[PDB]
Amino acid sequence: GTVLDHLVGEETMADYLLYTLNKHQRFGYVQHYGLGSACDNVERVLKSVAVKLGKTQKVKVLTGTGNVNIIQPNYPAAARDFLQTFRRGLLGSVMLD
Amino acid sequence: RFLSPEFIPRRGRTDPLKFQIERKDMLERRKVLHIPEFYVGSILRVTTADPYASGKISQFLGICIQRSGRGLGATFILRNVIEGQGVEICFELYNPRVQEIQVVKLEKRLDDSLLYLRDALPEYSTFDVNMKPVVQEPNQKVPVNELKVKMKPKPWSKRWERPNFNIKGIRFDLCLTEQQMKEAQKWNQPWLEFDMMREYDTSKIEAAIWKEIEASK
Amino acid sequence: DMPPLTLEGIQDRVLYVLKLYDKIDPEKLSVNSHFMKDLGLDSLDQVEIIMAMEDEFGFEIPDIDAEKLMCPQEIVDYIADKKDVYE
Amino acid sequence: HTGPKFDIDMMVSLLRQENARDICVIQVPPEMRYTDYFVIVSGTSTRHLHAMAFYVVKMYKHLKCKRDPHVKIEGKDTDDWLCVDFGSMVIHLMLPETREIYELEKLWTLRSYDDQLAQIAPETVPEDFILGI
Amino acid sequence: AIQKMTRVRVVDNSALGNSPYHRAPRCIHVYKKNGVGKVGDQILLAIKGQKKKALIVGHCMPGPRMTPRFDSNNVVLIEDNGNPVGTRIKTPIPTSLRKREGEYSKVLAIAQNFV
Amino acid sequence: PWSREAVLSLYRALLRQGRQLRYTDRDFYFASIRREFRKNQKLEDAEARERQLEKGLVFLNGKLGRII
Numbered sequence: 001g002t003v004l005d006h007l008v009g010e011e012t013m014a015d016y017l018l019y020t021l022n023k024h025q026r027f028g029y030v031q032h033y034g035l036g037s038a039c040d041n042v043e044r045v046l047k048s049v050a051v052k053l054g055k056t057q058k059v060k061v062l063t064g065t066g067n068v069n070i071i072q073p074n075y076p077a078a079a080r081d082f083l084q085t086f087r088r089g090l091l092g093s094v095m096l097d
Numbered sequence: 098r099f100l101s102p103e104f105i106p107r108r109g110r111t112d113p114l115k116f117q118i119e120r121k122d123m124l125e126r127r128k129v130l131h132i133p134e135f136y137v138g139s140i141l142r143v144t145t146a147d148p149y150a151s152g153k154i155s156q157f158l159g160i161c162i163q164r165s166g167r168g169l170g171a172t173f174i175l176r177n178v179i180e181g182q183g184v185e186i187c188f189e190l191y192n193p194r195v196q197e198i199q200v201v202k203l204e205k206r207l208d209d210s211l212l213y214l215r216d217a218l219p220e221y222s223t224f225d226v227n228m229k230p231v232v233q234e235p236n237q238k239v240p241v242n243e244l245k246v247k248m249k250p251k252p253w254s255k256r257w258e259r260p261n262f263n264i265k266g267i268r269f270d271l272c273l274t275e276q277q278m279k280e281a282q283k284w285n286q287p288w289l290e291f292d293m294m295r296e297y298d299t300s301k302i303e304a305a306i307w308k309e310i311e312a313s314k
Numbered sequence: 315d316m317p318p319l320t321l322e323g324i325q326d327r328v329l330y331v332l333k334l335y336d337k338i339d340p341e342k343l344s345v346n347s348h349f350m351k352d353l354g355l356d357s358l359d360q361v362e363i364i365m366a367m368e369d370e371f372g373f374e375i376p377d378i379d380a381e382k383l384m385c386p387q388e389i390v391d392y393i394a395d396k397k398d399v400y401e
Numbered sequence: 402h403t404g405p406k407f408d409i410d411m412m413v414s415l416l417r418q419e420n421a422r423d424i425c426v427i428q429v430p431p432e433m434r435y436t437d438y439f440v441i442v443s444g445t446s447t448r449h450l451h452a453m454a455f456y457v458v459k460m461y462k463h464l465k466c467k468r469d470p471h472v473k474i475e476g477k478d479t480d481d482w483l484c485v486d487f488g489s490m491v492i493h494l495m496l497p498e499t500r501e502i503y504e505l506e507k508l509w510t511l512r513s514y515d516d517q518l519a520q521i522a523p524e525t526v527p528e529d530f531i532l533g534i
Numbered sequence: 535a536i537q538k539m540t541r542v543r544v545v546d547n548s549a550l551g552n553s554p555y556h557r558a559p560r561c562i563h564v565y566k567k568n569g570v571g572k573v574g575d576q577i578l579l580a581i582k583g584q585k586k587k588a589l590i591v592g593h594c595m596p597g598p599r600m601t602p603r604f605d606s607n608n609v610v611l612i613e614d615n616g617n618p619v620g621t622r623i624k625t626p627i628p629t630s631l632r633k634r635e636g637e638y639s640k641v642l643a644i645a646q647n648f649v
Numbered sequence: 650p651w652s653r654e655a656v657l658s659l660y661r662a663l664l665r666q667g668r669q670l671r672y673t674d675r676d677f678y679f680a681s682i683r684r685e686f687r688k689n690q691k692l693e694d695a696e697a698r699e700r701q702l703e704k705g706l707v708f709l710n711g712k713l714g715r716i717i
């Protein structure tokens with residue numbers, strides 16, 4: 001947050017911070033972050049956080065087989081909480097560099 | 098022995114003569130068109146005359162999901178997913194329109210109704226339109242499929258988790274939570290297992306139907 | 315009926331059918347120019363030309379050899395197999 | 402009443418005398434539960450199409466069997482496409498414009514194998530039923 | 535039965551029907567004396583900021599015995615003329631559509647599967 | 650294509666059927682088969698050539714529908 005955040009995309013820093021955490025500490029990150037298993041997929045972690053927060057909602061899609069209820073969370077909402085998760089000490093002390 | 102569900106009548110104040118009349122009519126039709134022994138799990142291909150055309154022949158293949166009705170009006174319903182569309186047709190057994198009924202794959206499932214297959218994953222109801230009949234030796238126990246089926250998200254056509262449905266063929270562990278299970282248990286009705294006047298024994302009734310049937314042939 | 319299969323007469327009837335075709339005109343058409351390159355005709359175009367030869371002489375052309383026939387001169391030589399012309 | 406019957410050979414010849422631009426007559430097998438014979442004919446103008454359709458139906462009634470049900474022309478309000486259904490014959494009157502866009506002959510000759518069915522693909526819901534952007 | 539404010543599925547190769555959008559198409563109106571619409575009935579649609587007429591082709595509600603019953607509410611987009619906007623119908627349509635009173639022949643013509 | 654022979658064979662075989670036509674306008678049938686073999690061809694990838702050939706092959710068979 002020292003420089004303007006407009007330079008980095010909303011979802012852009014997630015993969016870089018995932019790499020940095022995988023470098024130093026992952027088990028504590030997994031325990032604090034609510035992953036079923038350790039992985040390097042940003043989509044999986046974005047899905048894991050949304051369920052934890054509960055901000056997701058059922059949204060109907062109609063198909064020939066039937067009406068199914070997909071959950072379509074606030075991808076923007078998951079994008080920001082990452083910054084407070086890093087800034088707060090819950091994840092553990094990890095130097096990005 | 099196997100007696101077709103339709104022949105055994107429901108509890109009623111209907112005079113016995115009415116059933117005798119209907120049985121004779123059914124049995125005549127059975128001579129003309131062979132009705133195969135099928136169960137609720139089984140796979141059937143039904144050939145019918147198409148009235149909306151000039152006597153062209155239609156066949157439809159699918160899995161049986163329920164069998165109901167009594168007398169001539171007795172029915173069954175076949176399900177299948179054709180090229181990405183679920184289709185259900187209810188067929189009358191004694192409709193003259195039907196040409197031929199074949200048992201492609203004769204099997205029972207865990208439970209007597211399969212209406213939950215609508216809420217199950219699409220592939221569990223997807224059956225190949227052109228599949229070869231698979232036949233077993235005549236004096237063999239009717240084989241049971243002990244498949245339990247994975248489900249879609251929890252908004253379902255009916256609340257299957259409730260014990261009134263008594264569904265044994267659903268992977269509940271995968272979809273539901275423990276608290277949901279104990280919530281469903283509030284509708285248990287444990288006395289109903291032991292209600293003695295609630296039961297309907299068809300022993301003597303079926304015996305008399307057998308006597309009629311053996312007389313017919 | 316036996317028609318006299320003069321080599322010269324064979325040539326005349328072969329060029330007669332080619333001038334009948336829409337794509338190729340007698341201006342650039344010659345006895346020695348080939349269909350595909352010189353006359354600028356596609357492979358599918360060729361198939362129709364051989365059909366013209368098929369019904370005219372009334373002897374079957376197999377699909378195996380129809381491919382190699384890409385020249386009028388090749389044709390007048392091929393149909394010479396039907397009835398041998400020396401001259 | 403007795404004499405010529407309603408069939409393709411009579412019906413096509415009947416069309417041809419009103420300057421039917423193109424005629425495609427298609428034999429349909431019994432598995433396709435629609436008709437015995439499918440027919441497509443083109444026309445010059447909108448009023449020319451009405452001329453043909455109305456002649457065919459008029460002549461039909463003349464040679465029609467007593468018990469043979471009456472027929473209804475379809476799409477008189479429509480500009481380019483007219484259709485008439487008979488007992489075992491189905492006819493489509495169109496401009497050349499609508500022939501270029503419908504390709505009815507292609508559909509009925511080759512069913513599941515046509516180009517128009519190939520472009521369109523069935524849409525499937527994701528596993529675990531989660532959408533991602 | 536498809537009535538007012540019902541979500542429907544456009545089973546066509548038409549651009550308008552298959553286009554990705556934030557709204558599912560909704561039934562504005564049913565062209566019948568009573569509001570309920572069964573198969574073969576015409577209904578008005580609100581799709582993508584416009585009104586369009588459509589033909590009901592199969593529905594979830596049980597019908598007469600031997601008639602098929604689908605798992606989605608399927609409609610075909612049609613012009614007021616009666617000309618279908620799309621060219622092809624992937625999804626099967628019931629054969630019953632044939633004998634019913636009205637302009638059904640064109641839609642039958644562009645359909646591949648009869649059930 | 651799958652085979653350069655097979656496509657030229659198919660083009661041949663189809664036109665042979667055209668002679669046997671009875672009701673269908675023979676000029677249109679020929680015109681319709683010609684343009685199909687023109688605009689589709691000269692520009693395709695290897696995999697889709699297996700599909701387009703087959704499309705023609707079922708046209709040849711005429712099992713699902715035969716034009717007369």
Ligand SMILES: *P(=O)(O)OCC(C)(C)[C@@H](O)C(=O)NCCC(=O)NCCS
Nearest residue numbers: 356357650656689690691692693701702
């Ligand atoms: P001819 O020498 O003009 O070419 C033969 C061909 C056009 C049939 C073909 O072999 C070709 O050169 N292009 C292949 C593309 C294609 O569509 N293949 C035929 C599949 S039906």
Ligand SMILES: [Mg+2]
Nearest residue numbers: 253254255594
């Ligand atoms: Mg409900």
